[PDB]
Amino acid sequence: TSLFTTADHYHTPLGPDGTPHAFFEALRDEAETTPIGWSEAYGGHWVVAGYKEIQAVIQNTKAFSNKGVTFPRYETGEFELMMAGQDDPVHKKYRQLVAKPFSPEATDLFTEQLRQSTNDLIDARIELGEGDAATWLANEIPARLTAILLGLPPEDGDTYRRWVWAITHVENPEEGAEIFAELVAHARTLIAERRTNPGNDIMSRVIMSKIDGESLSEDDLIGFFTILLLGGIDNTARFLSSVFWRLAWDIELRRRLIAHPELIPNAVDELLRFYGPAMVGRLVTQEVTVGDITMKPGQTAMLWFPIASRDRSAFDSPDNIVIERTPNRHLSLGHGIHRCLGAHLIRVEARVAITEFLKRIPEFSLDPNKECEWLMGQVAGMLHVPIIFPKGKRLSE
């Protein structure tokens, strides 16, 4: 038998711990012999699991197009995913408009706002001694940051989460499309308001931008709105939820981050390696051979980053969280021309989130009377992480 034959990122076997990591480890073992395999799922597609094979695919933009970045395709109506769903020269043209606001220098400026936000959020339940770390904290830190980036009201997270759920998980196609159409309606309204009253946020920036002397179409602006929403509300939230779950039970990891705060940045990169939630697809546009496998135009290759990030030929002791690991050339944020636009921002965000969480609540554990839940998909991670902790005090009454 082979684990590739029915591999499906939306239907990964979960182990007794509640994660797909036993399955991922078994697939990684198989990938040492067969780094690329055919899956019968989604009508047939290639699963790319080896580190060097993923790198070969991701670097070869001539044969592998980002038109297949989401597979099955996200529900975004007739709109394509801005930057992520495009090839050069179109892709580069748009990324250039937002490179600066996402640079390390610029994103470092969010640090104190995030620190304050994390503490204000913790205040909401610290006196209760219990809460769902995903719903209460991991979801809300990036939701509020995303609202700030987009110039939206930070308190409307539930609305934003409902849009993103429709894009990424709603089964019924008509329901999904209708809810994405609600996002579009809200985006158009936002865009019109900012045309006359622009702020300092990223939507205002692109709305006032030009390419070769021309303003962006409303459709292109809706694309920008949608991709930034996804990175925050889906990718970041699921990553942080998985991290908080791990910290809840792994008392050895936890004590080391508290004793050595200087290691938190390196530990965040190791946690990205280990709990990085994303996979991406590529559409094959010309016949190409990778390793032993020849792929044909029209086929899709899924890049199983979590498996490659556990490849023994790329990482010593890959199944262990080695917080002092360096270098750490993991693929959780991609590589090459499409490498995560939000990479520096989310590294800052994670550092702060972990730091303040462990400062405020050094002692906690998983709730024995409530269930954790892992969400499978193209972005996969914990969705519910009930924890308990000694009742504490608010910083701000």
Ligand X SMILES: CC1(C)O[C@]2(C)CC[C@H]1CC2
Residues that bind ligand X (CB under 6 A): 69-70, 84, 227, 230-231, 235, 278, 280, 378-379
Give the side-chain half-sphere CA count within 13 A for 24: 23
Cα-Cα-Cα-Cα torsion 296, 2, 33, 28, nearest 10 degrees, comes to 100
> Is residue 374 classed as helix, strand or coil in its secondary structure?
strand
| Shortest Å distance, C-beta 183 to ligand HEM | 16
**Nearest in space to 362 (alpha carbons), one of 263, 260, 258, 267:** 258
Q: What is the helix (H) or strand (E) element at residue 386, kind and residue range?
A: strand 386-388
Which CB, 3 or 379, lies closer to ligand X? 379
| Shortest Å distance, C-beta 247 to ligand X | 24
Which residue of this chain has its Cβ atom nearest to ligand HEM in the complex? 231
**Nearest in space to 223 (alpha carbons), one of 97, 109, 322, 138:** 97
Which CB, 87 or 178, lies closer to ligand HEM? 87
| Shortest Å distance, C-beta 235 to ligand X | 5
**Nearest in space to 114 (alpha carbons), one of 352, 395, 360:** 352
**Contact partner, 228, from ligand HEM, ligand X, none, Cβ < 5-8 Å per class:** ligand HEM
Which CB, 139 or 235, lies closer to ligand HEM? 235
**Nearest in space to 4 (alpha carbons), one of 205, 301, 396:** 301
Which CB, 91 or 254, lies closer to ligand HEM? 91
Q: Which tokens hold the place of 158?
A: 């539930």
**Contact partner, 168, from ligand X, ligand HEM, none, Cβ < 5-8 Å per class:** none
Residues in binding site for substrate = 235
Q: Is the peptide bond before 327 cis (omega within 30 degrees of 0)?
A: yes
**Contact partner, 236, from ligand X, ligand HEM, none, Cβ < 5-8 Å per class:** ligand HEM
What's the CA gap between 39 and 46, in Å, rounded? 6
Place of tokens 């697809």: 281
Residues making contact with ligand HEM (CB under 6 A): 66, 69, 83-84, 91, 95, 149, 227-228, 231-232, 235-236, 239, 276-278, 280, 332-334, 338, 340-342, 345-346
The region that residue 79 occupies, defined by phi over 0 for left and psi between -120 and 50 for alpha, beta otherwise, is beta
Per-residue DSSP letters for 54-76? HHHHHH-TTTEEGGGSSSSPP--
- Pairing mode, strands 386-388 and 365-366: antiparallel
Residues in binding site = 66, 91, 95, 235, 282, 338, 340
What's the CA gap between 50 and 375, in Å, rounded? 24
| Shortest Å distance, C-beta 337 to ligand HEM | 6
**Contact partner, 382, from ligand X, ligand HEM, none, Cβ < 5-8 Å per class:** none
Residues in binding site for heme = 66, 91, 95, 282, 338, 340
| Shortest Å distance, C-beta 28 to ligand X | 20
Which CB, 37 or 277, lies closer to ligand HEM? 277
Which CB, 236 or 355, lies closer to ligand X? 236
**Contact partner, 332, from ligand X, ligand HEM, none, Cβ < 5-8 Å per class:** ligand HEM
| Shortest Å distance, C-beta 393 to ligand X | 37
